[PDB]
RNA sequence: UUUUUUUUUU
RNA sequence: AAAAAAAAAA
RNA sequence: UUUUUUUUUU
RNA sequence: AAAAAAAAAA
RNA sequence: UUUUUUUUUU
RNA sequence: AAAAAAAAAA
RNA sequence: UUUUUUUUUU
RNA sequence: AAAAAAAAAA
RNA sequence: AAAAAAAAAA
RNA sequence: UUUUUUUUUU
RNA sequence: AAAAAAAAAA
RNA sequence: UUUUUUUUUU
RNA sequence: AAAAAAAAAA
RNA sequence: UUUUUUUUUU
């Protein structure tokens, strides 16, 4: 700093304020996968004392990012695809992440366009999730609101 | 720009952290009683009613206090603000009053970055002193 | 300038629309009671008052309110507006208050680009907490 | 950009107007007979197919016409426009014909702005002559 | 250039997807009836005669529409376009005119940002009114 | 931008195609066995998978080949690509070979515009080799 | 910059003065009577209040003086102060009013380089009238 | 960014 | 102000 | 290449 | 307009 | 280093 | 002063 | 691209 | 950063 | 932004 | 001559 | 002298 | 004269 | 010399 | 935007 000691504020009227604000975050959760079966991300996922999210009921998902957690069938390299989902109406993308190292995790993202960046509540679900491992790490970026 | 979903080429795992600090500017009013310091207590801090109940700690950088009910009969309102520390007390009274009596008074101060660390819920901020019955608060701080 | 009517050289028939648009600024006023949330309905854009009622649609851009009738004895106004959206209500509590007993509170929030759709008149705009007993709102919108 | 809900630091409450003027060119038909001059009423304007009831006053800034139907056989269409004003009427007789039998006939005239006072629904606009038995018009005009 | 097939020095196995998105439009007709309006379902825009039946959802950014079919004896042409929303449908009704009766009327309107979401194939996109039996449309959307 | 629909001023009725090209990257692994060359078959390009059997034809430009399974033990993995062509079949074996054995082996090559002609499911694009039991493609291809 | 300790390389021992002099602005009130004039005494500087009792002698640099409790019904606040030197008093009146019956009233006097000598505690600062019951004072001062 | 060895121009 | 040792940064 | 700690030279 | 915290991009 | 969100300073 | 919607002009 | 009306930002 | 194949402009 | 008092640095 | 603390002027 | 198809560099 | 959505280079 | 109305020209 | 007729201003 500069001061080492307390100085005045020579504060004006009472400002505008909000006890509960909007944030900003990158969300990491594991999901459980099974082989040949796509998994329905839910929304209510990203809600929670462990994210410091609990107090939020509604949250504009951004982007989604998805690494495979575990280690793949023998003989094979990871894979992970991903499906948005929306409201609206589904996708039927699969944005599909390969290792080119068996000992490597997959990784995959897709990006929400402006567009469709409305909000999501705990019922809803956010992607399908496929892979060859039976679990997959996703990072999603949102704002909490 | 895009109308819609596009691919986004990840790559390796990123470092993460699921339970991240926030800079934040807490309001919250404490009751005052005539000729008696109230000391502002951190717990007041951390509540779901913030979306901090889940930090035990912050770091607190200024404080600013609005006196929030009317004076007495024929005064101006005042408000007074003493510093508090854990490695030791300020005895500055930093005061505002107002020059209109149907108008808030008010007073702030400043920690300096060397007085900047961390405080639990036991601890108190500072002392606030009034003729007005209650104050309204805006703690600017750090919870980590 | 011309004194006088003019010819005009028409050509084809161009495109019309008997039924445009219109970027309007709707004022109009809730009751509030004491520690309770009033959800302002969407249906108080649509009327005759505000030259509306031929529309059934509208896009909301942005809220303001401000307290309509004095506060409390001893006490400041304010007023709080909490955004609430069909896909998903908000939790913020954006909140104005006076620091002159005999003023007005304000305050207000913008909705983003990606979250201006319609609105019918069965939906509700915000919610309003006071401690007046009225509250003016001027609701920038875009009816369709 | 913004992808959530902002904060509006309002002041003070605004200038408002709940029923505010609007700009426009209104599209509608008048039936015209052979021979006959028709007076286009400016009670027309104001309609809700237009948004435009809660209007009773609307300033007329310029008038373009076409025909609407095909007219009589072996001929092209015309269609001539005489200004009326509550001052006194005009004797022009602005006019435009067809060079393609199969294609409308269009003309226009131009108030000046020393003649754009405020007319009201008993009032008439023009006097339309055709040889068709419909006429399109598209009145540019300011309601309030 | 080159005449022969040459080496390609790959890398690492690629970000891939089988099934993307497609920047598309999209022509077909509907049927109109006199005086009566017609809802565009978007299950039209679903069709192994565009190569689109692999998509359930679509993104439309704009709706342009002849008239196909020639007018009723005495009249020229004209389409009209109201835009349907699932939050809300509009009122504006964008018509054109055609000035020679042996043409095509034509119009068309385009969605803005905030109201480009996806519609399934029970949804609706706009409605279609006519003194045509026929109206082709041409739709430019993104299938995803 | 604009927040709502606006007019499009459409003109005549403009050139159409509702079966339009498609430059694609295809995704797609086929079975090898040990010192056998596999035919890649066209017709595997065309399928509902790819949003693509309304084609019946396509342009291949490019052909990248990687190991999908990990190679036999003590081996690192190997692929070859020999180029097919109905004018007549090359003889060149484009190989890419791995340097560790837990990773892929890769390699393509490219096609010349002179031999960039259109192909059919019957039609062959390469012959495939590796000492892994399966290889993954991905096809850079005009679908027409 | 630096996270230890480090050395300072003092030289030989320095001027010292454990009792220094000190420029402060000092803020008390006074009692006013109706019609009567009040000496301010310079006895009032030295308070443990203030952290002066140390001192013993000041030499005052200007006086600033605000009402402190509302004025007579009907009447808007005012406060006079009349400068006092000890050799030899002044006859001035430095007069503020307020213009809104809910404010204070302001007013001051700068003391010029060639009367600012010292004052003990049995010497008076000004007179000050007003037809509030309390007057207070901000009096800018070194302390030697 | 260009040298040597099989084929086309300056 | 430069250099050497430990550390941090780029 | 800058800064911090120890050292040194100036 | 700059800086800090979270995020995204480069 | 630019933007978005929270904060702060101006 | 720029932008969005309606209109008018170019 | 300029202006008029409604809105918004500054 | 120059380049293509399909769409909203100039 | 300058100046006066206490302090620190040069 | 720069900064920190109190003050003052702007 | 600009240019390709295969190899030793940047 | 170039923005978004399916494929190749920098 | 500019502007408004009618006309002609570009 | 020039010129011609009527008008006006200068
Ligand atoms: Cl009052
Ligand atoms: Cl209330
Ligand atoms: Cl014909
Ligand atoms: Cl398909
Ligand atoms: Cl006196
Ligand atoms: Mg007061
Ligand atoms: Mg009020
Ligand atoms: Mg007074």
Redesign the interface.
Known sequence: ?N???????????????????????????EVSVQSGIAFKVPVGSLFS????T???????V??V???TQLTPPV???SFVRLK?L??????????????????T?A???????????????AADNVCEVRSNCRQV?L?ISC?F?
Request: proline share 7%; charged share 20%.
């Open positions: 700093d001061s080492n000691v307390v100085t005045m504020i020579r504060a004006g009227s009472y400002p505008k304020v909000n006890p509960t604000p909007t944030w900003v975050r990158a969300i990491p959760f004392a462990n994210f410091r609990d107090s939020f009921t509604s949250v504009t951004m982007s990012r998805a690494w003989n094979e390299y948005p929306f409201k609206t109406g589904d996708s039927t993308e699969e944005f599909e992440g390969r290792a080119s190292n068996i000992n995790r990784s995959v993202g897709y990006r929400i366009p402006t567009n469709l960046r409305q909000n999501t509540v790490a990072v704002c609101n």
